[PDB]
């Protein structure tokens, strides 16, 4: 009945420091639907973070995309702090250029 979330922190368009882009945070394979998705820049949470509406799959598991505008730097850190009941501790996944 329970399923553990699957996260991916990536950008819409190819990464390029200095150029404005969009950072996605695709969470999938989680049940129940109760999920908390935060997007942080250098530790601090980001303000305008739009979140796609929720929708599950034939395997009954849910998924949802969350993005927010950002401008890549070679020294700026980006991560997605996701909170979910099947997770003993709120997993914080970091953005990896090559992923």
């Amino acid at each position: 009945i329970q399923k553990t979330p699957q996260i991916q922190v990536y950008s819409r368009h190819p990464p390029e420091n200095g150029k404005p882009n969009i950072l996605n945070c695709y969470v999938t394979q989680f049940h129940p639907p109760h999920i908390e998705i935060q997007m942080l820049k250098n530790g601090k949470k980001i303000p305008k973070v739009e979140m796609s509406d929720m929708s599950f799959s034939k395997d009954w598991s849910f998924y949802i995309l969350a993005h927010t505008e950002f401008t890549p730097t070679e020294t700026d850190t980006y991560a997605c702090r996701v909170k979910h009941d099947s997770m003993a501790e709120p997993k914080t996944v970091y953005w990896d250029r090559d992923m």
Partner: protein, 125 residues
């Protein structure tokens, strides 16, 4: 603890008259693994020795089978819509009786479907 495909077979059980076209479909859920392989565990055996039947790509219509005790005449398989891999048996003979089940490989880990009985229909009538 990443992704894990989901194999669904249909039907879960079956049996028939010596001589019928048995078609078994395998539905793979997930984009974490392409293609599909159909396995078989011969009914006649004490030790669970799986036997590779066939492999099908999720893209190309190219199928890779096994040239062993050339059974090319009783085995036939195609690929349908939504990750649907069909495996039909040409004439359910005695050499076909056994347990069938599909497998797939995602990020090096092998996943297996619940086995599906394909024995002779209660041998009655």
């Amino acid at each position: 603890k990443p992704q894990a495909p989901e194999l669904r077979i249909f039907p879960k059980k079956m049996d028939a008259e010596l001589g019928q076209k048995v078609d078994l479909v395998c539905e793979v859920l997930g984009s974490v693994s392409q293609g599909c392989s159909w396995l078989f565990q011969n009914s006649s055996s004490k030790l669970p020795q799986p036997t590779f039947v066939v492999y099908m790509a999720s893209s190309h219509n190219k199928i890779t089978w096994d040239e062993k005790l050339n059974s090319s005449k009783l085995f036939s398989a195609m690929r349908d819509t939504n990750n649907k891999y069909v495996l039909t048996l040409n004439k359910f003979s005695k050499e076909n009786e056994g347990y069938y089940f599909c497998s797939v490989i995602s990020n090096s880990v092998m996943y297996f479907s619940s086995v599906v009985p394909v024995l002779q229909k209660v041998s009655s009538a």
